Design a protein around this ligand. Structure first.
Ligand SMILES: Nc1nc2c(ncn2[C@@H]2O[C@H](COP(=O)(O)OP(=O)(O)OP(=O)(O)O)[C@@H](O)[C@H]2O)c(=O)[nH]1
Ligand SMILES: [Mg+2]
Lengths: 81, 84, 532, 74, 299, 597, 134
RNA sequence: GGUUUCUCUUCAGAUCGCAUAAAUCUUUCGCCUUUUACUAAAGAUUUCCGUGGAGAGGAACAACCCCAAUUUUUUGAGGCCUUGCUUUGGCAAGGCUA
């Protein structure tokens, strides 16, 4: 069981931003992210690497095609590892 | 078995399989290379080692930066752990 | 000192910027009136909820602490008296945390008024029924009350350990009592209601099976998901939709039949839920030293040598936490049925907002955006620790309240054409409620409850708050029509007739604080109070 | 082990999904697999230039499933 | 600021300074290896366990990545300095493992001494001993040469023995210690070996290809020993200017390696002094004694 | 540490000092006079460790002077509280039965050794005699095996790495079958109450309400007062006193110190297990048919088949290998609703005296058809009980002084191990020693004391003679509590001497703890003692009631001396301090002299 | 009861306990108070030494029987553990070495070394009357 | 390092100690000769039977063969060009391949 996957599972309810394999950055309140990081969320605002925009009331994010995940600073305060 | 948890809690710059040089405080290693970094910066344009003209540029703020093992490329020690 | 208010904010699982986030969100909000019959599990259940929520609050293993009920009088009186504001963040089996605004109301008759006061500020309602008492007075009258005040209704069948360790039935007979309670509830609604089918059948997911002294809460779906957690590869909805009904389960095909395969076989619910809960309660209460380590390992559950040596109630409450995990089934069922303030405001503005549902203010409240006019509706009040001053308590219906602003407050008998029943004040502060402590904020949008300092002086019972500048079309939301009527009477007189202004002030304080209390100044100059 | 794709929520509905290589389609999600490979009917592909090709039902490459988003509200 | 660190509850026979000047490895009868910082708040991060006996000798490799740990459990274990793990054990000694030293600049060779009378050589990748010099008596101190070809061992036989690895034959014997020779240490130039004697006569002996044949180069008097029968090892300055010695006289002695004068007689300990190590970059002195407490003196 | 000395040491030195009248000593006399003062601590500490007659004989550590000058009992009586209540349930059953069966209950013949009959030496007789096997009532071996092996041991589980902390016998933990067995053995001293709906009007709140309002409830206590238009009244039924107690703010004008009634505990459904077969979870006859009944059920958009669904198969129910119930699960469920001494598994140890095995039958509300005599007994107990309910502050201040620690810290005193009854006989020996010492110290060759603590005059004393023959309540009170000791310890002396019975012993000790006001006389010196005199007679009456219910009647033999002994040691706890002050003063007068000025 | 091997050490032990009864029932008419109780302490020492030497000297009474004698008080646990130390081999009793019973703050004269007790000085324990226990 | 048993010192009970003793005063009351003793209320204050918390010091007892088609050691994301934007470098698009 992964510590980063666990932090991601916790990330539900807070803001999450996802850089994809193509390099787009999407932001939204994370609902449920599985062990395989398949992030099925809602109200995603995604900006593409060239500057174009897009937004959806819902979104799905395949796991193996995730480039990065940045959450709000609520997490920075599990330290036992 | 300490290959990550030895410098864990330390600052390190890890180059991704895409190339961004993310320098931050290591939050945990992983069997897959599942990595987390707190107080995170990422470098794209250059990595400063006494760069007189510029040293901190093409720098994105990540903060909590959680990356998986697929996008893991290389690691080096870059920072001493924050006393926080 | 009369209350239990603390100032140190204890350890949370969530974060404060994220709480401001969810208040900004305007979709994950569900404002519920948690009501039930006399001693049916309301505040011990919310005790289970807060016990889950905060890592440092547990039961004290001998008596369950009532975090919710805030009064020395209540803790001494042992019964339900006043509605209590609580604010929690709760995730579902998906994990999606939810902004639940609970009004843990009383289950007593003489205090239906605070239950109405939490109803008038609510969008959904949750009725707590003892498994062993049956359908009783306030069960009936509060269900009808929520129906005709147009509240979404949800059922929680609590205290089934009263069935498993006190009545001690066969699982089929506890399920007989279970369908007894659920069908009687649904029938009483279908009597009290219009063509809107609020028939509560847990296959639709409007019923929670729970045990609040012993830390159990789940719906058919939630148990299906605990299964699909044990053996990953089962599906939530279609296992739970075969978890209620007269359907049997044939394991030579491994398939559920709607015909009984043999003469002696047990239904899906009977063998999948009402079997293992009887199993757990028995094996944990009766045979601890012999084979209970085996039972815990067969359950995958791991308890310390400190936890095994514990008393029977610490052990069972602890194992039930260990087993059901997070209390997600309650919140799954409520988010499943309870409208969010957006889809709760239209019936609220309909029955509530006098000025009209379809209008400028009416439609700004229907959309309930944080940028309409300020419309706050105050139909409760809560005093400070010394009790000297009140705080005005309601929710937001339009706009956003900011501390530091002045407001025009308009009361019961105020209308537009008169302009003679008003007052102007500055609002002092803003809080988000928790039974013992409040989190003071700066900007509160529509869609959430509110506690406000300073405007309690021009409150009699119920009022509305808007800004003085602009919006000369607002009427005050309809005052509350109670489930009962003031027939009981008291005649009071101080031993010192000269302190009489003070006793008068006090009767004014209680007329503001107890929402069903009326004061009369009789024809011989006596003080009388009309109550129930 | 053998986790299931959590697409029953997007199931029975239509979604606009990008598959790798600049590929974009839209169709009614009727199922999936444990490898996430989903056969979603009414596939209409919108090429990068705007060409519209309604091919009927097809499967979605799971390895190459870049990202799908539902075309309606929950 | 002499910086007294407490936490070693037993006699601290070894306190060894990392040649980079950042950390300390201290151990004794405590059986634990405390690894301390020198900067910050002088805080110890890890404790290393796995020796069931008293850790008779802590030492660093010239890189400072391997911590050699000779202990009375008949073991010369290796620790990874980064994590605190044991890597392997050099077992085979059939009496108390007394002394250990690392080959300098070379491929890792280890020299060890024990109370069976054997001086045993170790090439870590073989999990056993290669060559063994039974002197006739117990072995108390052993040290390498910088050429990694000759061994200098001090025992209770009043003779400091230099063996050549290739002849396997005793090439040099230094006489001049009148009691048990407790501890030796070769200098950073490899040119002179500082040696302690319970008879309290500190001797510097130069190893060169061409020698005066009587290497009683410099004699110090002051390292005062008594009943406790403690093994005593000594230290050289980073640049060879000072010579530091623990004793039993509750004080530490510092002589000038050149003029042989007692530059410092330093208080602070209440018991017999076990080891005094030199800070590799500044004039700082690390003192551990039978008082079981550690001083980071600066001079 | 003070290493231990032989019990023959103490027996030996005290046999030398049987009479401090052999010239050879010539100093141990003044020694014992100094020693006298602390006897009130020796008395309390001796009595406060009763041998507990579900056993035969107890040996204990004691603190005795190297010159035998005095002997205190140095040991604190901790017991595991469920063990306590279980043994006492066993004793209720056993003495219940022994008077049920003994055709004519001969009681003890009280003080049975002559005023001049010298006291027995343990070494003389009780060193030798057999223990007269004890009261013990037999356990059913299969069902009582949980507690079978260790129940009637003295400090049962002191050396139990599984159950108590250690030799301290602190901090017990048990197993649930043993818990159900202890519940069974104590079932007769345990109320069957699960809710607080019994004491609605009978609880602390309403009874302090009644105290301050000067109001009274039918079956409740009474107290002093803390202090001391007709036309328009509408009357159908009367505004009553219990109404002014249940709603004490409304129908009560001018409330003072008035508590908040109406605590409503849900009327709990509890169904008892009677015979074993009866699986623990089966529809009991008393429960009523369910008959789930209403209109049409409803529809849901249920997931019809033929569209698609199917599971890959690992699944089994969350408990499948586990059976539903066990054989002792009924007893385990009773372990979910039992009194507190039997609802638990783990806790800390208390003293033998703070366990009211009898408390709530005289807390019970309306026994309804008793003689008014015992009814008033119950009300007196509610009286004193409401008093010590209303009257508990926290300690409010604390020093943890250690006194026997300080004593044994000295060379002059030592410890040993002998028989409790040897301790008692030596106690009465030394006590009369010191008393006659005091007399002959005051040169009273014209007065004497017996061994049964009656001061006998050799002649009719003259003006000055009988004038001086007056003694202060200090002397008298020590004398008469020492006579309480003579009585109880010589009663156990008779039982160990084998000359009545174990059950006759217990009835005689209860005879003491019920008729001391017929045996010692201390009230005469301290008229407040009559309050405990009341409590004595009250509890004697009540336990005669609940004793003489079956085949036993108004006869002699009720063996229950837990409670009387308990409140007695309460009284002694209060008085030994004051007594010691008075002793110190009299002694100072007696040696340093009356303060001249 | 005790474990096996009892009936062979029960006779001598009950005999030492009868000696204890006599040493308890003797009066002290005209005798020193310590000469009245030193027989008691000494016979207790004899029984203690019997059981303790059966334990550690002869091992004829095993851990089981010796522990039974310890718990049931036929063996002096303190005296056994005291002879289980150096310098305290031949001790008569423990007060003879415990400072608590010392007015001049010095142990019993029964423990002065034969080199530091005068030639012919009869070592005299004030507590047990011993003759020298170093 | 772990458990256990004792010793000694420090500190803490505005609800605790689901246990409940004694005194003192200082206010009201009666027993009704006097002092008592009491009465039987209050207010408070002390003492006792326990207790808590922190440490310190010693003793006993367990111990030091096969595999990768969504997340990294099989991954077939390969190449070129035209256009544009850029101070050049460089970067954006499409197309063609085999
Ligand atoms: N046996 C059993 N008792 C319970 C359970 N849950 C709560 N209780 C008890 O039932 C009693 C009912 O009290 P509450 O839980 O506060 O009931 P309520 O619905 O809040 O009623 P009010 O607040 O008085 O209006 C309490 O004493 C609880 O301790 C349970 O699961 N099993
Ligand atoms: Mg409640």
């Amino acid at each position: 069981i992964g510590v980063p996957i666990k932090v991601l599972h916790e990330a539900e309810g807070h803001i999450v931003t996802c850089e994809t394999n193509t390099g787009e950055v999407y932001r939204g309140k994370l609902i449920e992210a599985e062990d395989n990081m398949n992030c099925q969320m809602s109200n995603i605002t995604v900006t593409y690497r060239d500057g174009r925009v897009a937004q959806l009331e819902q979104v799905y994010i395949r796991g193996s095609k995730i480039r990065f995940l940045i959450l709000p600073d609520m997490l920075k305060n599990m330290l036992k590892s | 078995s300490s290959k990550m948890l030895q410098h864990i809690d330390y600052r390190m710059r890890c180059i991704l399989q895409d190339g961004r040089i993310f320098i931050g405080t290591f939050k945990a290693f992983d069997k897959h290379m599942n990595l987390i970094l707190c107080d995170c910066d990422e470098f794209r344009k250059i990595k400063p080692k006494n760069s007189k003209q510029a040293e901190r540029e093409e720098k994105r703020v990540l903060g909590l930066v959680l990356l998986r093992g697929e996008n893991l490329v290389s690691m080096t020690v870059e920072g001493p752990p924050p006393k926080d | 000192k009369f209350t239990l208010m603390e100032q140190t904010l204890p350890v949370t699982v969530y974060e404060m910027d994220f709480l401001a986030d969810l208040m900004d969100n305007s979709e994950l909000i569900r404002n519920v009136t948690l009501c039930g019959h006399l001693h049916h599990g309301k505040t011990c259940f919310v005790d289970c909820l807060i016990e889950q929520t905060h890592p440092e609050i547990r039961k004290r293993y001998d008596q369950d602490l009532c975090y919710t009920d805030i009064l020395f009088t209540e803790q001494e009186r042992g019964v339900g008296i006043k509605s209590t504001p609580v604010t929690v963040v709760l995730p579902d089996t998906k994990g999606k945390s939810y902004l639940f605004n609970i009004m843990d109301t009383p289950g007593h008759v003489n205090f239906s008024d605070e239950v109405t006061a939490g109803l008038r500020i609510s969008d959904g309602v949750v009725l707590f029924i003892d498994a062993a008492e049956g359908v009783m007075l306030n069960t009936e009258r509060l269900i009808k009350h929520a129906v005709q005040e147009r509240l979404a209704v949800t059922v929680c069948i609590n205290k089934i350990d009263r069935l498993i360790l006190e009545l001690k039935l066969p699982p089929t007979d506890a399920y007989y009592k279970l369908r007894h309670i659920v069908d009687e509830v649904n029938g009483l609604i279908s009597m009290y209601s219009t063509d809107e089918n609020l028939i509560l059948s847990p296959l639709l997911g409007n019923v929670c099976f729970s045990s609040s002294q012993y830390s159990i809460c789940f719906t058919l779906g939630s148990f299906a998901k605990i299964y699909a957690d044990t053996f990953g590869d089962i599906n939530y909805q279609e296992f739970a939709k075969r978890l209620w009904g007269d359907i049997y389960f044939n394991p030579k095909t491994r398939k559920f039949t709607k015909k009984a395969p043999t003469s002696s076989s047990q239904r899906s619910f009977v063998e999948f839920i009402l079997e293992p809960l009887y199993k757990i309660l028995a094996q944990v209460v009766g045979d601890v030293d012999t084979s209970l380590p085996r039972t815990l390992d067969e359950l995958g559950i791991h308890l310390t040598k400190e936890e095994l040596k514990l008393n029977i109630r610490p052990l069972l409450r602890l194992v039930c936490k260990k087993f059901f995990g997070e209390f997600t089934g309650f919140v799954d069922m409520c988010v499943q049925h309870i409208p969010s303030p957006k889809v709760g405001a239209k019936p609220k503005i309909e029955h509530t907002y006098t000025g009209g549902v379809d209008s400028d203010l009416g439609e700004a409240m229907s959309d309930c955006d944080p940028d309409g006019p300020l419309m706050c509706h105050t139909t409760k009040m809560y005093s400070t620790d010394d009790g000297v001053q009140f705080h005005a308590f309601g929710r937001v219906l339009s706009g956003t309240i900011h501390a530091g602003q002045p407001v025009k407050v308009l009361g019961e008998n105020y209308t537009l054409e008169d302009e003679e029943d008003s007052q102007i004040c500055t609002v002092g502060r803003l809080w988000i409620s928790v039974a013992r402590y409040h989190i003071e904020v700066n900007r509160v949008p529509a869609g959430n409850w509110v506690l406000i300092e300073g405007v309690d002086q021009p409150i009699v019972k119920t009022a509305t708050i808007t800004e003085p500048r602009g919006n000369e079309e607002a009427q005050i939301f309809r005052p509350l029509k109670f489930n009962t009527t003031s027939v009981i009477k008291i005649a009071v007189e101080p031993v010192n007739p000269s302190e009489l202004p003070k006793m008068l002030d006090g009767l004014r304080k209680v007329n503001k604080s107890y929402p069903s209390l009326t004061t009369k100044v009789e024809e011989s100059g006596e003080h009388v109070i009309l109550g129930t | 082990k053998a986790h299931p794709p959590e697409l029953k929520k997007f199931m029975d509905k239509k979604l606009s999904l990008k598959l790798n290589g600049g590929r974009h389609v839209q169709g009614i999600l009727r199922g999936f697999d444990p490898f996430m490979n989903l056969v979603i009917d009414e596939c209409v592909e919108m090429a990068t230039s705007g060409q519209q090709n309604n091919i009927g039902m097809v499967v979605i490459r799971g390895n190459s499933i870049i990202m799908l988003e539902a075309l309606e509200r929950v | 600021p002499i910086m007294l660190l407490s936490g070693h509850e037993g006699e601290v026979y070894c306190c060894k300074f990392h040649p980079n000047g950042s950390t300390l490895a201290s151990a004794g009868f405590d059986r634990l290896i405390l690894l301390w910082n020198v900067y910050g708040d002088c805080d110890n991060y890890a404790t290393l366990k796995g020796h069931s006996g008293a850790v008779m000798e802590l030492h660093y490799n010239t890189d400072g990545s391997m911590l050699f740990s000779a202990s009375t459990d008949k073991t010369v274990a290796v620790w990874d300095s980064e994590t605190g793990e044991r890597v392997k054990r050099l077992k085979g000694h059939t009496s108390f493992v007394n002394s250990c030293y690392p080959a300098r600049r070379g491929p890792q060779l280890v020299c060890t001494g024990s109370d069976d009378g054997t001086v045993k050589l170790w090439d870590i990748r073989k999990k056993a001993a290669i060559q063994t010099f039974q002197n006739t008596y117990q072995v108390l101190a052993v040290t390498f040469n910088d050429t990694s070809d000759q061994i200098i061992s001090g025992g209770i036989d009043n003779d400091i023995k230099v063996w050549d690895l290739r002849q396997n034959k005793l090439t040099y014997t230094m006489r001049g210690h009148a009691d048990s020779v407790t501890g030796l240490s070769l200098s950073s130039e490899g040119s002179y070996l500082l040696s302690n004697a319970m008879d309290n006569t500190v001797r510097v002996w130069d190893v060169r290809p061409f020698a005066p044949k009587e290497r009683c180069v410099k004699i110090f008097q002051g390292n005062v020993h008594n009943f406790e029968k403690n093994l005593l090892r000594c230290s050289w300055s980073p640049d060879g200017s000072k010579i530091a010695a623990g004793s039993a006289d509750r004080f530490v002695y510092v002589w000038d390696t050149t003029s042989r004068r007692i530059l410092y007689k330093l208080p602070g300990h209440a018991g017999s002094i076990n080891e005094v190590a030199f800070h590799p970059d500044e004039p700082i002195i690390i003192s551990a004694s039978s008082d079981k407490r550690l001083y980071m003196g600066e001079i | 540490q003070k290493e231990d000395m032989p019990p023959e040491h103490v027996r030996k030195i005290i046999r030398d000092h049987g009479d401090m009248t052999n010239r050879k000593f010539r100093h141990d006399k003044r020694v014992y006079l100094g020693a006298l003062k602390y006897m009130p601590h020796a008395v309390l500490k001796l009595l406060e460790n009763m041998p507990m007659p579900w056993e035969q004989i107890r040996d204990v550590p004691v603190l005795y002077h190297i010159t035998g000058a005095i002997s205190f009992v140095n040991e604190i009586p901790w017991v595991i509280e469920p063990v306590y209540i279980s043994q006492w349930g066993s004793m209720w059953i056993m003495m219940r039965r022994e008077k049920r069966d003994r055709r004519h209950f001969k009681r003890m013949r009280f003080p049975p050794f002559d005023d001049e009959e010298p006291p027995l030496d343990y070494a003389d007789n009780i060193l030798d005699v057999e223990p007269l096997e004890a009261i013990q009532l037999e356990l059913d071996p299969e069902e009582d095996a949980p507690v079978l092996d260790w129940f009637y041991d003295h400090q049962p589980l002191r050396d139990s790495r599984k159950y108590v902390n250690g030799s301290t016998y602190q901090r017990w933990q048990f197993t649930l079958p043993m818990m159900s067995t202890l519940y069974r053995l104590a079932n007769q001293l345990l109320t069957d109450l699960v809710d607080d709906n019994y004491f609605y009007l009978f609880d602390l709140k309403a009874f302090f309400t009644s105290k301050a309002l000067n109001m009274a409830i039918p079956g409740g206590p009474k107290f002093e007062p803390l202090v001391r238009d007709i036309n328009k009244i509408i009357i159908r039924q009367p505004i009553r006193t219990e109404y002014k107690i249940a709603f004490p703010y409304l129908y009560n004008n001018l409330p003072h110190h008035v508590h908040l009634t109406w605590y409503h505990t849900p009327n709990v459904v509890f169904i008892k297990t009677e015979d074993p077969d009866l699986p623990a979870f089966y529809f009991d006859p008393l429960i009523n048919p369910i008959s789930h009944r209403h209109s049409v059920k409803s529809q849901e958009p249920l997931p019809d088949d033929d569209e698609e669904f199917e599971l890959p198969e690992f699944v089994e129910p969350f408990l499948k290998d586990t059976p539903l119930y066990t054989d002792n699960t009924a007893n385990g469920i009773a372990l979910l609703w039992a009194p507190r001494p039997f609802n638990l598994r783990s806790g800390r140890t208390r003293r033998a005296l703070d366990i009211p095995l009898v408390k709530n039958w005289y807390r019970e509300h309306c026994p309804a058809g008793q003689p008014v005599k015992v009814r008033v007994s119950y009300q007196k107990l509610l009286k004193y009980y409401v008093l010590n309910a209303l009257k508990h502050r926290p300690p409010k201040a604390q020093k943890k002084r250690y006194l026997f620690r300080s004593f044994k810290a000295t060379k002059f005193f030592q410890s040993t191990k002998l028989d409790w009854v040897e301790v008692g006989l030596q106690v009465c020996r030394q006590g009369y020693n010191m008393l006659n010492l005091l007399i002959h110290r005051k040169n009273l060759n014209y007065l004497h004391l017996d061994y049964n603590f009656n001061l006998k005059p050799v002649k009719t004393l003259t003006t000055k003679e009988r004038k001086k023959s007056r003694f202060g309540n200090a002397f008298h009170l020590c004398r008469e509590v020492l006579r309480l000791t003579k009585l109880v310890v010589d009663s156990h002396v008779q039982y160990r001497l084998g000359n009545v019975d174990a059950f006759q012993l217990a009835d005689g000790l209860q005879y003491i703890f019920a008729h001391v006001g017929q045996l010692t006389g201390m009230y005469r010196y301290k008229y407040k003692l009559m309050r405990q005199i009341r409590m004595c007679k009250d509890l004697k009456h009540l336990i005669y009631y609940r004793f003489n219910t079956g085949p036993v009647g108004k006869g002699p033999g009720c063996g229950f001396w837990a409670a009387g002994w308990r409140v007695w040691l309460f009284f002694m706890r209060g008085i030994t301090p004051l007594l010691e002050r008075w002793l110190g003063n009299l002694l100072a007068r007696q040696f340093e002299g009356r303060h001249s000025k | 009861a005790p474990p096996d091997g009892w009936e062979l050490i029960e006779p001598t032990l009950d005999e030492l306990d009868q000696k204890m009864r006599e040493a308890e029932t003797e009066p002290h008419e005209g005798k020193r108070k310590v000469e009245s109780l030193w027989p008691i302490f000494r016979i207790h020492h004899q029984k203690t030494r019997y059981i303790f030497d059966l334990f550690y000297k002869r091992k004829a009474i095993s851990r089981e029987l010796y522990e039974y004698c310890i718990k049931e008080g036929y063996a002096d646990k303190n005296l056994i553990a005291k002879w289980k130390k150096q310098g305290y081999e031949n001790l008569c009793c423990l007060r003879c070495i415990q400072t608590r019973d010392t007015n001049f703050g010095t142990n019993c004269i029964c423990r002065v070394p034969k080199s530091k007790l005068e030639v012919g000085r009869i070592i005299e324990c004030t507590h047990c009357g011993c003759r020298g226990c170093s």
